[PDB]
Symmetry: C3
Subunit: 148 residues, 3 copies
Amino acid sequence: SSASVVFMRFAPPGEETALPPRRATPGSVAYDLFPSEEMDIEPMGLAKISTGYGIDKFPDGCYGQIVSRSGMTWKNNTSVPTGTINVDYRGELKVILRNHSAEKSVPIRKGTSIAQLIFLRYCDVEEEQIVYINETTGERTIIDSSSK
Amino acid sequence: SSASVVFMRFAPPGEETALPPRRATPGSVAYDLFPSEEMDIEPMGLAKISTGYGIDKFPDGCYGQIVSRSGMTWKNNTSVPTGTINVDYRGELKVILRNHSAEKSVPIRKGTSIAQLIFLRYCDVEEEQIVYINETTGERTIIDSSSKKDNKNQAESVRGT
Amino acid sequence: DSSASVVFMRFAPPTALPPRRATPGSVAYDLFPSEEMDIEPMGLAKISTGYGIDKFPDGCYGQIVSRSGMTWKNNTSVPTGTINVDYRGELKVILRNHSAEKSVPIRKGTSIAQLIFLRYCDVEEEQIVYIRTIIDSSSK
Ligand SMILES: O=c1ccn([C@H]2C[C@H](O)[C@@H](COP(=O)(O)OP(=O)(O)OP(=O)(O)O)O2)c(=O)[nH]1
Ligand SMILES: O=c1ccn([C@H]2C[C@H](O)[C@@H](COP(=O)(O)OP(=O)(O)OP(=O)(O)O)O2)c(=O)[nH]1
Ligand SMILES: O=c1ccn([C@H]2C[C@H](O)[C@@H](COP(=O)(O)OP(=O)(O)OP(=O)(O)O)O2)c(=O)[nH]1
Ligand SMILES: [Mg+2]
Ligand SMILES: [Mg+2]
Ligand SMILES: [Mg+2]
């Protein structure tokens, strides 16, 4: 399971839903995410968009980070201001998309990806300590310690 | 001690400070960060908020990236527009939080977390080259090459301006 | 071997200062502009850096992120920055000005963003399931 992922589709197999997460090319590092439903994000608006899928299984030692796509950012003057997917998350992935235009609305459409998902390697910390370091003497005082 | 972290609290053990960085659940990838000071971020404002802690020791091969939390982003219409913590940083972690509301202020309160810190794996590059590639012929020219210093040579340091 | 090595490609013949880490503990390469401009209030700029990535370190891709100073001092953000490992073009920094009144001066001597080589998983096996019914399965 070092390089495998399992996405969970929230809609029943007979029902119409979002296009599945897909990497555009063999060198694409992220899966393009698509909306389940259409909308127009008003100027200066912030939208929480359902993608139709969750992550059932993550690659070993990775989590999912939703980041913006260059096209959506540049062409539509947007950003994706958050996107950290915890490895115990059993829900549907939502894309949070901000419109930075004071005048133009952002069209959200079924066939156009709105953001992309990267499987980043992170450290799942096993031992943590909080210390106070005395700047004059160099003395270290352990405040708290915890083992996961 | 490859999957271990040490946070340094800047306030002496007898003084009131921020709640320590803490992961909310066993599957939470990031440590929730708390403020050591209170304020109200004006509409369209940007704040640099002290957390009360630094990182004394990072997990092997990782650095710290401060990123936004979904709740703070969505409920308070904010973003965390920067957050790269270098592995030689000995200072206090500060959260840079932007308010995107044109009308409402964002309340920053002790005990309410404002961002989260992830220990991401990165490549500490040891060898680098700069090349020029001719688009018509395909010929390559090496412009520069550098190997990251590894305490082989020492020299007296000289003051700047 | 190529586990901790990078090759940058300069587009100008033997226009911008090269990507450079400020200190031994700096995790990212500061990127510099190959052109000057003033980003109008609430503007969004796509700034050329003068360099591409010819070779990435093994198992890494390039992520362009904001620098703290540029963000705080100039009220900016870097709202996108994912560099695919098959990208043969010049790196562009997308920089947003969040000020309603002040412009952001972009000048060749000042770094505008920074590039981190992050470790990621290049997925080899993927499945779509309905919760279990396998909907689709694909091997890269
Ligand atoms: O763009 C995003 C970000 C997060 N999430 C989901 C998955 C993630 O595991 C969960 C919580 O994210 P985070 O830890 O950033 O938010 P929080 O404010 O701590 O959430 P809560 O206290 O509701 O858990 O929300 C999304 O679907 N989309
Ligand atoms: O959200 C953030 C980002 C950075 N930092 C600290 C730790 C980091 O190591 C240092 C420098 O960050 P960066 O390299 O992004 O900033 P810079 O503009 O290059 O800073 P400087 O030249 O002042 O070091 O600032 C924070 O506390 N919070
Ligand atoms: O800040 C950025 C982001 C991206 N890129 C380049 C390199 C990257 O490989 C390419 C595509 O980025 P992304 O996949 O985010 O954008 P897209 O809208 O999906 O474009 P494409 O259709 O090429 O994948 O654009 C930049 O130069 N600067
Ligand atoms: Mg793409
Ligand atoms: Mg959380
Ligand atoms: Mg720096």
